[PDB]
Design a protein around this ligand. Structure first.
Ligand SMILES: Nc1ncnc2c1ncn2[C@@H]1O[C@H](COP(=O)(O)OP(N)(=O)O)[C@@H](O)[C@H]1O
Ligand SMILES: COc1ccc(NC(=O)Nc2ccncc2)cc1
Ligand SMILES: COc1ccc(NC(=O)Nc2ccncc2)cc1
Ligand SMILES: [Cl-]
Ligand SMILES: [Cl-]
Length: 386
């Protein structure tokens, strides 16, 4: 009877419930409102979420992430060939052409299809909701990117069925974000909505039209390899060069564990820089037992990422051109994805749209789950949200 909305994200997942017309985004057992889409295998246990991301640098070969980049794809696809450079875990092709993720679990070699890894993330999100509700949860609405094909959607639905969920519907991420803001019920007449979704690994821009409660995806664009991890890498590359200038040319990049530890701290400092003018990147015994410390101003972060931030406007211009419409015709700009919290990105979008304030009242990394939760309640017969 109870239905949840799940954003099964590339890097982070989020679960919400819409009861009595209001939406609660549910915190996990660490108090986090989003959960890493990570699954790790050790000598003793299967870790999911925060626990899996937290030991990634200690167990790189057996820590799986990015299964969303493989779900519903053939191993031979050029996307898989190109993406696999980024993965410390092994991925091979089965006789059926499906990707097989290979890990060691309890001293044994184990293989998993992408939908099996995603089913474990979905199972964790289901359990996060169940702990909060104190009752079992069976029904769910799961979101997918607008460009996902039938194979990708079907495999995501299968991941839900494996997790023990009755998938009421698979819906588009940009549409879920628009539903979260009630833009389907907002007044009347045609409304042109731009969804600017910049997450941990991907960037998606979608131009929607809403006429009479019906959402149509007019045009989409973006970059499948532009997200928060690329901004973290700018801080990593800077710190690697700064360590060289401080420690007689010593190169941290020669040690992959030193890079991973630095990357964890670079991402934390990046988050701090979204609400403070300065942040510290500190790693004790980073490389050769040498302690590392550096202060980064928001201005230096903005400078390192200057081109990447400005280039987010290129897919915005593309969707407007494809939809044959002017930027002045966009009624609402919705900010989605954790990276939209970066002040410079918010300023660039506002300036592009001639001072129009973007819709950001909902925590951007929760807006998709929030909309999916609303849709789950509607599909369960609850008309209180409307
Ligand atoms: N406060 C913050 N400032 C800057 N970046 C932030 C942030 N809070 C979260 N992020 C970034 O958001 C990304 C994850 O975004 P999210 O929307 O949850 O992930 P996803 N799987 O949908 O792509 C990470 O790169 C994270 O560092
Ligand atoms: C209702 O019970 C169900 C039981 C099993 C599945 N699917 C399943 O096992 N699929 C799969 C895909 C790829 N690799 C391994 C497994 C779905 C529903
Ligand atoms: C310095 O400015 C920028 C540089 C690169 C990007 N994106 C990017 O590398 N895209 C990509 C997509 C798919 N495969 C590989 C790469 C964005 C801004
Ligand atoms: Cl419900
Ligand atoms: Cl409760």
């Amino acid at each position: 009877e109870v239905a949840i909305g799940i954003d099964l994200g590339t890097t982070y997942s989020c679960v919400g419930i819409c009861r009595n017309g209001v939406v609660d985004i549910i915190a996990n057992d660490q108090g986090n409102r989003t959960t890493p889409s990570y699954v790790a295998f050790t000598d003793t246990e299967r870790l999911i979420g925060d626990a899996a991301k937290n030991q990634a640098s200690r167990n790189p070969e057996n820590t799986v992430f990015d299964a969303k980049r493989l779900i519903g794809r053939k191993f031979s696809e050029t996307t898989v060939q190109s993406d696999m450079k980024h993965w410390p875990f092994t991925v091979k092709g089965g006789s059926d052409g499906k990707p097989m993720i290979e890990v060691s679990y309890q001293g044994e070699k184990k293989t998993f299809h992408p939908e099996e890894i995603s089913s474990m993330v979905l199972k964790k999100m289901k359990e996060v909701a169940e702990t909060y509700l104190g009752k079992p949860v069976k029904n769910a609405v799961i979101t997918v990117p607008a460009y996902f094909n039938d194979s990708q959607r079907q495999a995501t639905k299968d991941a839900g069925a494996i997790a023990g969920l009755n998938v009421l519907r698979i819906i588009n991420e940009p549409t879920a974000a628009a539903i979260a803001y009630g833009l389907d019920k907002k007044g009347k007449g045609e409304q042109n909505i731009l969804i600017f979704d910049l997450g941990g690994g991907t960037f998606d821009v979608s131009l929607l039209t809403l006429e009479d409660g019906i959402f149509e995806v007019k045009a989409t664009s973006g970059d499948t390899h532009l997200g928060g991890e690329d901004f973290d890498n700018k801080l990593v590359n800077f710190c690697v060069q700064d360590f060289k200038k401080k420690n007689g040319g010593k190169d941290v990049s020669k040690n992959s564990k030193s890079l991973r530890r630095l990357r964890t701290q670079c991402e934390k400092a990046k988050r701090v820089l979204s609400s403070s003018a300065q942040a510290t990147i500190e790693v004790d015994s980073l490389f050769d037992g040498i302690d590392y410390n550096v202060n980064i101003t928001r201005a230096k972060f903005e400078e390192l990422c200057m081109d990447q931030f400005r280039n987010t406007l290129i897919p915005v211009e593309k969707v407007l051109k494809d939809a044959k419409m002017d930027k002045s015709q966009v009624h609402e700009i919705v900010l989605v994805g954790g990276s939209t919290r970066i002040p410079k990105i918010q300023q660039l979008i506002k300036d592009f749209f001639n001072g129009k304030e973007p819709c950001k009242a909902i925590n951007p990394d929760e807006a998709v789950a929030y909309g999916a939760a609303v849709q789950a309640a509607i599909l369960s017969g609850d008309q209180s949200s409307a």
